[PDB]
C-alpha cells in the first residue's frame, strides 16, 4: 500500500567529529551516522504520483535547515553592543589606492573588557557616520563555525519507505511509472544562495523547467540544468587578519590592518560556458511558450540586494555578486564574463526575524568553487503584443533549493 | 476586508513624481506575500501595474514601462507600501488601488484578501481655479415639469460638490459626473426637475461648493426677461 | 488570443432574475472574480473558479466550461447591481456593468442657451438634457445650422436612479464666442429606442 | 569586574601573617541605574587581579555542594 508518511525527516552523514565545520557538525552531531553502500529496489508495475509543490518533505527540510541557525545564535552568536556611532573616513590607505566606495573604514570608541575603559578602534562598513544596527543586529562569528553546504542523507522513517522516481524528465507533479524504493536520499546539501542553484542535482536528459503554474507569473521558474557550470569565486584582496576578541562581550571583529590590493570581489566563470546553458534554456522556453517565441532575458528591476544580486555564502562570508550581464540578452528562435560582487556579513535570515552578522573572514582572501546546476527566473508577461517573453532573476524563497531535489523523493506508508 | 490605508488623492504636473502610500495592520502585512497595484482610468476598467514582495522587496510588472516608470518599495517594520511614479504623464491620470495577496494561494489564481481605500492621482499643469457658474435658463415658451440646472464650468482640480437651495432640493436632482475638458480643466453640470409653470416666479439657487479652492458660489437659474 | 474576453459588456436583468456572465479565457487555470461599486474598491466575490469568498452570498456561484469561465448570480437583489470584473492571474477581463432591466423610456428632451456671462467670457455651453430615460444608450447628434458637431461636445450621464431606475444624460456642445455667434440654430437631435424619430430641440443665437 | 584596589590585612583581630586574604575596595553599582557604592571584597593568592576571562559568578541561595550517593540501575 502506498500512502504516507507526511511528514518527517531523518538526516545523517559519515562526517567525523574531527571536523568542526558548522554544517558538518549539523550532520555529525545534530544528526546520526549514515549508511554507505546505497541500494534501491525498483517497484514492479507500480506508478507513484508526486507533488513537489505541496511536498511536506520540502516544508520540513526548509524549516529544519533554517531552524539549524538556532544552533548558532544560541551558544556563542549573540545580539549585543556595540552599536556606537561609527565615523567613517576615506579609503585606507597606501596600497589602496582604489576607486571603491564600498569599503568604509570607520572609527569608534570600543569599550573593552573593563567596565568603563574605551578605546579608539576601526571597523568596516559596506555599501558620514552610523549607518548600522537600528535593528535585530545579531553579531559574533565565534571560532570555528565556518559555513559550507555539506551532503546530508535523509533516511526513511521507522516503518516507512522512501520512493524515488527514476524518470529522466519528471515534472515533479505527475505520475511516475519508473520508481524505486531507496533506504535514504542521495545526500542533499543545504545550499545557501539566491537566483542561482549551486551544487544541486542535474537533469538526466534535457534541461528541466518546472513551475506550479508556468503561466502564473507570481510563480518562480525552476530551471534545472543537465550540465554543471563551475563558478570559481575569489577575493582579489586581503585583510581582517584573523580575529581579536577583547572581553566577555567585546571583540575586535573586522578591519585587521594589513589591507592589500583592495578592489571589488568577483567570481571567474567562462562567459561562453553558461551562455551555452542559456541557449538550452531559451530552447526549452520557446517550446513551452508558442513553440517559436523569442526569449529575452533581463536583470533585476529592484528589490533587496539579497535578491537583486547573486547572494551566496562563501566560507561564512556572504557575497552579493551582480550578474546582470548574465541576463542582459535576447535569443531569437577566449573571452569570459566578469561579474562585480560585494561582500557583506549582514544577512536577513528567517522572515525578517533578525540579521545574522559574522566576521572576520580570518586569514585573508578566499576561494570558493561551486557548480551551477540550475536557475530561478521570473517571467514579466504582457499583452498580445508581448511577442518576445521576458525573464528576470527570481529567488527569495530558499525552499526552492530543496524543491529542486525533493521533487523526485516521496516517503510512503505501507499496510 | 478592512480597506488598506492609502494616502489622500493628489494632483501633480507632467514630468513630476509622486509616492502613493498604502499600509495596514501587521497581521494582514504578514498574511500577504506580494503587494500588488492596479489603476483605473476615469470611466474605464482595471489596468494592472505590478507587484512588490513583502519578504524581499523583489518587483515585477505588466510592462517594462511600469518597471521604469513605477518603483514599488516596501517596509515590513512600518507595514507600509510605497509606489513611486516618475515622469508622470497625462495618461497616468487615474485612480490607484493596492491589493494584498495572502500566502498559500496555490493554483487558485490571483485572489486578493484586502483592497486599498483608493487614491486619485491627476497629472495636469493646470493651476488651481474656481468654477464659473452659468445658469441653464429654462424655456417658458414639454411636460408639466422641466429640467433646470447650473453649469459648473472651468474648475480645477476636482472635485466639486453642488447643492440646491442649501440642500433643501435633493429630490429629483441629477448631478452629473465631472468630465475633463481638453483645456485641462474639469466641468460638471447639475440639474433639478421642477414645475414648468413655476419658472420665472420661483427662485432656483444652486450652491456650488468647490472644495479644492474653497470657493462657494451661489447662482440663480431663472428664465430671462 | 486575448487573455480574457468578458461579455457581455453590459447586462440588464430584473430583480429576482439570474445573471449569467461569460469570461472567455485564452488558457487553462483557476479564475477569480471581483465586485466593484461606484466609488468603492474592488471586492473578491469568487475565487478558484467556483469557490466564493467568505461573506459572499450563496446566490453567487461560479464555474467553467472548457475555457469559458461562467458566472451565475441567482435571485438578484436591487443591491446586487454593480460593476464586475474577471481576472486570470495578473490580467483582468473586459469588465461588465450589471444593470436593472426596465421597460424602454423615452427621454424628456430639453435644450438650454448658454449664459450671457459665458458668451462674454469668450465661450459657450450649448446644453441638451435627456431627463429620465432608459436605457442610457442613446444617439444624440448636434446640428449647428444643420452642421454635425462631433468631438466639439462632451457628454455626461448619471447612473441608474435608485427609485426611477432610469438615467439622465447631459450633452454639452462646447463653442467659442465666435463660432457661437457665427451660427444661429443649435439643433439637438435625440435618437433613442423609445423615440419614434430623432427629437429636434433648438434655439436662436443668444436668445431664449 | 571593576578594578578592585587592595589594602593590608583587616584589621584588629588579625593580626596575622597572611598575604593570601586581600581586602580590596571598589565602586559597586547598585540596583539603581547609575548609583555606585564603595564596598569591600576578597582576593586570594596592587589592584585588579580578577576576571579577564569567563568568570562565572553568583552562588545563589541553597545550592550547597557535597557528594551524594547516587545509584545507577540497569538499562
mmCIF file with all atom_site columns, N, CA and C in Angstrom, chain C residues 144-170:
data_model
loop_
_atom_site.group_PDB
_atom_site.id
_atom_site.type_symbol
_atom_site.label_atom_id
_atom_site.label_alt_id
_atom_site.label_comp_id
_atom_site.label_asym_id
_atom_site.label_entity_id
_atom_site.label_seq_id
_atom_site.pdbx_PDB_ins_code
_atom_site.Cartn_x
_atom_site.Cartn_y
_atom_site.Cartn_z
_atom_site.occupancy
_atom_site.B_iso_or_equiv
_atom_site.pdbx_formal_charge
_atom_site.auth_seq_id
_atom_site.auth_comp_id
_atom_site.auth_asym_id
_atom_site.auth_atom_id
_atom_site.pdbx_PDB_model_num
ATOM 1  N N  . UNK C 1 144 ? -25.483 72.294 -35.719 1.00 0.00 ? 144 UNK C N  1
ATOM 2  C CA . UNK C 1 144 ? -25.434 73.750 -35.647 1.00 0.00 ? 144 UNK C CA 1
ATOM 3  C C  . UNK C 1 144 ? -25.573 74.375 -37.029 1.00 0.00 ? 144 UNK C C  1
ATOM 4  N N  . UNK C 1 145 ? -26.730 74.976 -37.287 1.00 0.00 ? 145 UNK C N  1
ATOM 5  C CA . UNK C 1 145 ? -27.120 75.334 -38.645 1.00 0.00 ? 145 UNK C CA 1
ATOM 6  C C  . UNK C 1 145 ? -27.081 74.123 -39.567 1.00 0.00 ? 145 UNK C C  1
ATOM 7  N N  . UNK C 1 146 ? -27.548 72.986 -39.062 1.00 0.00 ? 146 UNK C N  1
ATOM 8  C CA . UNK C 1 146 ? -27.555 71.750 -39.836 1.00 0.00 ? 146 UNK C CA 1
ATOM 9  C C  . UNK C 1 146 ? -26.138 71.288 -40.148 1.00 0.00 ? 146 UNK C C  1
ATOM 10 N N  . UNK C 1 147 ? -25.234 71.481 -39.194 1.00 0.00 ? 147 UNK C N  1
ATOM 11 C CA . UNK C 1 147 ? -23.863 71.004 -39.329 1.00 0.00 ? 147 UNK C CA 1
ATOM 12 C C  . UNK C 1 147 ? -23.469 70.117 -38.155 1.00 0.00 ? 147 UNK C C  1
ATOM 13 N N  . UNK C 1 148 ? -23.055 68.891 -38.460 1.00 0.00 ? 148 UNK C N  1
ATOM 14 C CA . UNK C 1 148 ? -22.783 67.898 -37.428 1.00 0.00 ? 148 UNK C CA 1
ATOM 15 C C  . UNK C 1 148 ? -21.623 68.329 -36.540 1.00 0.00 ? 148 UNK C C  1
ATOM 16 N N  . UNK C 1 149 ? -21.893 68.465 -35.247 1.00 0.00 ? 149 UNK C N  1
ATOM 17 C CA . UNK C 1 149 ? -20.847 68.753 -34.272 1.00 0.00 ? 149 UNK C CA 1
ATOM 18 C C  . UNK C 1 149 ? -20.502 67.517 -33.451 1.00 0.00 ? 149 UNK C C  1
ATOM 19 N N  . UNK C 1 150 ? -19.412 66.854 -33.820 1.00 0.00 ? 150 UNK C N  1
ATOM 20 C CA . UNK C 1 150 ? -18.966 65.658 -33.113 1.00 0.00 ? 150 UNK C CA 1
ATOM 21 C C  . UNK C 1 150 ? -17.493 65.758 -32.739 1.00 0.00 ? 150 UNK C C  1
ATOM 22 N N  . UNK C 1 151 ? -17.211 65.693 -31.443 1.00 0.00 ? 151 UNK C N  1
ATOM 23 C CA . UNK C 1 151 ? -15.869 65.954 -30.935 1.00 0.00 ? 151 UNK C CA 1
ATOM 24 C C  . UNK C 1 151 ? -15.751 67.374 -30.396 1.00 0.00 ? 151 UNK C C  1
ATOM 25 N N  . UNK C 1 152 ? -16.744 68.203 -30.703 1.00 0.00 ? 152 UNK C N  1
ATOM 26 C CA . UNK C 1 152 ? -16.807 69.557 -30.165 1.00 0.00 ? 152 UNK C CA 1
ATOM 27 C C  . UNK C 1 152 ? -17.745 69.630 -28.966 1.00 0.00 ? 152 UNK C C  1
ATOM 28 N N  . UNK C 1 153 ? -18.136 68.468 -28.455 1.00 0.00 ? 153 UNK C N  1
ATOM 29 C CA . UNK C 1 153 ? -19.034 68.399 -27.308 1.00 0.00 ? 153 UNK C CA 1
ATOM 30 C C  . UNK C 1 153 ? -18.557 67.363 -26.299 1.00 0.00 ? 153 UNK C C  1
ATOM 31 N N  . UNK C 1 154 ? -19.032 67.486 -25.064 1.00 0.00 ? 154 UNK C N  1
ATOM 32 C CA . UNK C 1 154 ? -18.760 66.489 -24.035 1.00 0.00 ? 154 UNK C CA 1
ATOM 33 C C  . UNK C 1 154 ? -20.046 66.024 -23.365 1.00 0.00 ? 154 UNK C C  1
ATOM 34 N N  . UNK C 1 155 ? -20.162 64.715 -23.168 1.00 0.00 ? 155 UNK C N  1
ATOM 35 C CA . UNK C 1 155 ? -21.372 64.131 -22.598 1.00 0.00 ? 155 UNK C CA 1
ATOM 36 C C  . UNK C 1 155 ? -21.113 63.586 -21.200 1.00 0.00 ? 155 UNK C C  1
ATOM 37 N N  . UNK C 1 156 ? -22.130 63.652 -20.346 1.00 0.00 ? 156 UNK C N  1
ATOM 38 C CA . UNK C 1 156 ? -22.053 63.062 -19.015 1.00 0.00 ? 156 UNK C CA 1
ATOM 39 C C  . UNK C 1 156 ? -23.401 62.497 -18.584 1.00 0.00 ? 156 UNK C C  1
ATOM 40 N N  . UNK C 1 157 ? -23.416 61.215 -18.239 1.00 0.00 ? 157 UNK C N  1
ATOM 41 C CA . UNK C 1 157 ? -24.654 60.532 -17.881 1.00 0.00 ? 157 UNK C CA 1
ATOM 42 C C  . UNK C 1 157 ? -24.649 60.117 -16.415 1.00 0.00 ? 157 UNK C C  1
ATOM 43 N N  . UNK C 1 158 ? -25.795 60.268 -15.759 1.00 0.00 ? 158 UNK C N  1
ATOM 44 C CA . UNK C 1 158 ? -25.962 59.791 -14.391 1.00 0.00 ? 158 UNK C CA 1
ATOM 45 C C  . UNK C 1 158 ? -26.204 58.289 -14.356 1.00 0.00 ? 158 UNK C C  1
ATOM 46 N N  . UNK C 1 159 ? -26.064 57.698 -13.174 1.00 0.00 ? 159 UNK C N  1
ATOM 47 C CA . UNK C 1 159 ? -26.256 56.262 -13.007 1.00 0.00 ? 159 UNK C CA 1
ATOM 48 C C  . UNK C 1 159 ? -27.717 55.929 -12.740 1.00 0.00 ? 159 UNK C C  1
ATOM 49 N N  . UNK C 1 160 ? -28.042 54.641 -12.777 1.00 0.00 ? 160 UNK C N  1
ATOM 50 C CA . UNK C 1 160 ? -29.428 54.198 -12.703 1.00 0.00 ? 160 UNK C CA 1
ATOM 51 C C  . UNK C 1 160 ? -30.083 54.650 -11.404 1.00 0.00 ? 160 UNK C C  1
ATOM 52 N N  . UNK C 1 161 ? -31.077 55.523 -11.522 1.00 0.00 ? 161 UNK C N  1
ATOM 53 C CA . UNK C 1 161 ? -31.731 56.103 -10.355 1.00 0.00 ? 161 UNK C CA 1
ATOM 54 C C  . UNK C 1 161 ? -32.289 55.020 -9.440  1.00 0.00 ? 161 UNK C C  1
ATOM 55 N N  . UNK C 1 162 ? -32.059 55.174 -8.140  1.00 0.00 ? 162 UNK C N  1
ATOM 56 C CA . UNK C 1 162 ? -32.413 54.142 -7.173  1.00 0.00 ? 162 UNK C CA 1
ATOM 57 C C  . UNK C 1 162 ? -33.922 53.959 -7.089  1.00 0.00 ? 162 UNK C C  1
ATOM 58 N N  . UNK C 1 163 ? -34.661 54.985 -7.497  1.00 0.00 ? 163 UNK C N  1
ATOM 59 C CA . UNK C 1 163 ? -36.117 54.960 -7.419  1.00 0.00 ? 163 UNK C CA 1
ATOM 60 C C  . UNK C 1 163 ? -36.744 54.868 -8.804  1.00 0.00 ? 163 UNK C C  1
ATOM 61 N N  . UNK C 1 164 ? -36.231 55.668 -9.733  1.00 0.00 ? 164 UNK C N  1
ATOM 62 C CA . UNK C 1 164 ? -36.772 55.716 -11.085 1.00 0.00 ? 164 UNK C CA 1
ATOM 63 C C  . UNK C 1 164 ? -36.236 54.570 -11.935 1.00 0.00 ? 164 UNK C C  1
ATOM 64 N N  . UNK C 1 165 ? -35.037 54.105 -11.602 1.00 0.00 ? 165 UNK C N  1
ATOM 65 C CA . UNK C 1 165 ? -34.403 53.020 -12.343 1.00 0.00 ? 165 UNK C CA 1
ATOM 66 C C  . UNK C 1 165 ? -34.090 53.441 -13.774 1.00 0.00 ? 165 UNK C C  1
ATOM 67 N N  . UNK C 1 166 ? -33.934 54.743 -13.982 1.00 0.00 ? 166 UNK C N  1
ATOM 68 C CA . UNK C 1 166 ? -33.591 55.274 -15.297 1.00 0.00 ? 166 UNK C CA 1
ATOM 69 C C  . UNK C 1 166 ? -32.338 56.136 -15.233 1.00 0.00 ? 166 UNK C C  1
ATOM 70 N N  . UNK C 1 167 ? -31.988 56.745 -16.360 1.00 0.00 ? 167 UNK C N  1
ATOM 71 C CA . UNK C 1 167 ? -30.782 57.559 -16.448 1.00 0.00 ? 167 UNK C CA 1
ATOM 72 C C  . UNK C 1 167 ? -31.097 58.957 -16.967 1.00 0.00 ? 167 UNK C C  1
ATOM 73 N N  . UNK C 1 168 ? -30.197 59.898 -16.700 1.00 0.00 ? 168 UNK C N  1
ATOM 74 C CA . UNK C 1 168 ? -30.249 61.209 -17.337 1.00 0.00 ? 168 UNK C CA 1
ATOM 75 C C  . UNK C 1 168 ? -28.916 61.560 -17.982 1.00 0.00 ? 168 UNK C C  1
ATOM 76 N N  . UNK C 1 169 ? -28.978 62.191 -19.150 1.00 0.00 ? 169 UNK C N  1
ATOM 77 C CA . UNK C 1 169 ? -27.780 62.480 -19.930 1.00 0.00 ? 169 UNK C CA 1
ATOM 78 C C  . UNK C 1 169 ? -27.648 63.973 -20.201 1.00 0.00 ? 169 UNK C C  1
ATOM 79 N N  . UNK C 1 170 ? -26.500 64.536 -19.839 1.00 0.00 ? 170 UNK C N  1
ATOM 80 C CA . UNK C 1 170 ? -26.181 65.917 -20.179 1.00 0.00 ? 170 UNK C CA 1
ATOM 81 C C  . UNK C 1 170 ? -25.183 65.985 -21.327 1.00 0.00 ? 170 UNK C C  1
#
